Amino acid sequence: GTITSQDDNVVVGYWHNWCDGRGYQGGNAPCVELKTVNPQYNVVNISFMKVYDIAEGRIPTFKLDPTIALSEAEFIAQIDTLNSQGRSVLIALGGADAHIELTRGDEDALAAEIIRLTDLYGFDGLDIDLEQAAITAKDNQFVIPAALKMVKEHYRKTGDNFMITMAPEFPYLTANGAYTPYLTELDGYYDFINPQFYNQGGDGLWIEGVGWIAQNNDALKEEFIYYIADSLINGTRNYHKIPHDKLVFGLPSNIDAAATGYIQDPQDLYKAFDRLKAQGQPLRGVMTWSVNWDMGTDAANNSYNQQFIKDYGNFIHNQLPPVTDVSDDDWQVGSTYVKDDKVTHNGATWTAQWWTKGEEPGTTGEWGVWR
Ligand code: NA
Numbered sequence: 001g002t003i004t005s006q007d008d009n010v011v012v013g014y015w016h017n018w019c020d021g022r023g024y025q026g027g028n029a030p031c032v033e034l035k036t037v038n039p040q041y042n043v044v045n046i047s048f049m050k051v052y053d054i055a056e057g058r059i060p061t062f063k064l065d066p067t068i069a070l071s072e073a074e075f076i077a078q079i080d081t082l083n084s085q086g087r088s089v090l091i092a093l094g095g096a097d098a099h100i101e102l103t104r105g106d107e108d109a110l111a112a113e114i115i116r117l118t119d120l121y122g123f124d125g126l127d128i129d130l131e132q133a134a135i136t137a138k139d140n141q142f143v144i145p146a147a148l149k150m151v152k153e154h155y156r157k158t159g160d161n162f163m164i165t166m167a168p169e170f171p172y173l174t175a176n177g178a179y180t181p182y183l184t185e186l187d188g189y190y191d192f193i194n195p196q197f198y199n200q201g202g203d204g205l206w207i208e209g210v211g212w213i214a215q216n217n218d219a220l221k222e223e224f225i226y227y228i229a230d231s232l233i234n235g236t237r238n239y240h241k242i243p244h245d246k247l248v249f250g251l252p253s254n255i256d257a258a259a260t261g262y263i264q265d266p267q268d269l270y271k272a273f274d275r276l277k278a279q280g281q282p283l284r285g286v287m288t289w290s291v292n293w294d295m296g297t298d299a300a301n302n303s304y305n306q307q308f309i310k311d312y313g314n315f316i317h318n319q320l321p322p323v324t325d326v327s328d329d330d331w332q333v334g335s336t337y338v339k340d341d342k343v344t345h346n347g348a349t350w351t352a353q354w355w356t357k358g359e360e361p362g363t364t365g366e367w368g369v370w371r
Helices: 070-082 108-119 140-156 179-184 219-235 266-278 308-315
Strands: 010-016 043-051 089-097 124-129 161-166 204-207 212-213 248-252 287-288 342-344 350-351
Touching: 010 248, 010 308, 043 124, 043 266, 043 350, 070 089, 089 161, 108 140, 124 140, 179 342, 204 219, 212 219, 219 266, 266 287, 266 308, 287 308
Parallel strands: 010 043, 010 287, 043 089, 089 124, 124 161, 248 287
Antiparallel strands: 204 212, 342 350
16 A cells, blocks of 8 residues: 655565475475564565466466465555565566566556556565576566556656666676666666675686685685675676665575575675775665575574574664665754755654744644644
């Protein structure tokens, strides 16, 4: 019912629309109820919107999985709850075996379906999380941006920031790379990008004085994080530019969540983030595959015991707000405010209609200066 957008730093977690996912190291990710997700996950990405059955045609949809044991009403109720805590719930488009192969002219229907779902479940936006085979499949590069622009405009008209994020695998983010049409077509529409810095093996970048810095090199983790992010935020070393304010670092929760890319020593991330902060380009947060893995089991049935949220939650939420933020100072008696000057007072935002001083928001009647 209420589009709830994030203007501050994010800790993003994917949520599995399936039970008992099998890990890379033989572990188990159970289905969990939304309201069970750790509250420091302030963006939760419902995975996935997909073609379940090609006989329904080319437009992906979302169907809550029965086996999670949650009525539709009940899942909507939990979204509402998240929204009441100021957290977002996005619908992730794509994933493995999504069968998304759209042809030119599909964008109208795709946008209609985006909107139908969004109004039905109360999603706050959409994560583009295509599998590799979809990135340039049929006309996806045209249809998906075209649809998402229409969706973004629809909700702008009605007061709302429908969030658009993306989860490109990082090697597709070279200048003029296969992902870059999504980035350029949705520039000024997208909120932030949370690339996957995992599942890409020896892919990496070369830095003089250091050598090849691979994504699966756990000994050079701080250098990897730092330089791959510095390249992206400056558009340098043959990477497409994603500004630091729109750049969230996507990681595996644990060694079961992905083949490679798990951060063994979280000090490697703190130190890289602090260097990026000290150079005036702090990152927007972190993302993880996945909340379900962060609550899941290893092969011996040992709980991962929410270690990823333990390691990054407070780190990121203790950061200074990014440029996106809406800072609204408390009302003050001796202050002169003017048309459009917002303040905070009694746990609510008030918006000055005209010249005022010494007039407390809430006492001003229904057609006084505070509104
Ligand atoms: Na919502």
